[PDB]
Amino acid sequence: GMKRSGYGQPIASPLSNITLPMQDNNTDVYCIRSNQFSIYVHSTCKSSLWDNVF
Amino acid sequence: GMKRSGYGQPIASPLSNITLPMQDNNTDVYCIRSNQFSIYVHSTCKSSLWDNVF
């Protein structure tokens, strides 16, 4: 969740969201339960003028 | 404060309570003010189906 400052210094929001795949319903802890695995990271950048709209 | 998950994996609640003896009214910090001491730990296990009833 990127935004902006008076000067214009771009600032990210500690209020950002990390999503792990779904396991045992909770999605706050994902575990690997297989013999092999591959991990990939992807991201989406959203912005706002107003706080928390994105 | 133990409970249960959909699968059944028993889970304890960070919402658990540790009680120290009473000193200077506050019970969040207990100090030893004697020449000798003995410390014992005891516990009670309570459970719930509904959250926070125990």
Ligand SMILES: *[C@@H]1O[C@H](CO)[C@@H](O)[C@H](O)[C@H]1NC(C)=O
């Ligand atoms: C993340 O999701 C929360 C709801 O938990 C939402 O309020 C917030 O705007 C989102 N933050 C992002 C997408 O940066």
Ligand SMILES: *[C@@H]1O[C@H](CO)[C@@H](O)[C@H](O)[C@H]1NC(C)=O
């Ligand atoms: C700094 O904050 C004050 C109070 O919100 C505001 O009046 C002023 O315009 C701000 N100046 C900036 C954004 O540089």
Ligand SMILES: *[C@@H]1O[C@H](CO)[C@@H](O)[C@H](O)[C@H]1NC(C)=O
């Ligand atoms: C601990 O006491 C709190 C009140 O501070 C209560 O709401 C909570 O259910 C108790 N947790 C236990 C006994 O695990």
Ligand SMILES: *[C@@H]1O[C@H](CO)[C@@H](O)[C@H](O)[C@H]1NC(C)=O
């Ligand atoms: C996972 O959570 C959703 C939303 O609360 C619920 O509909 C679903 O039945 C749950 N599945 C479980 C408990 O495995």
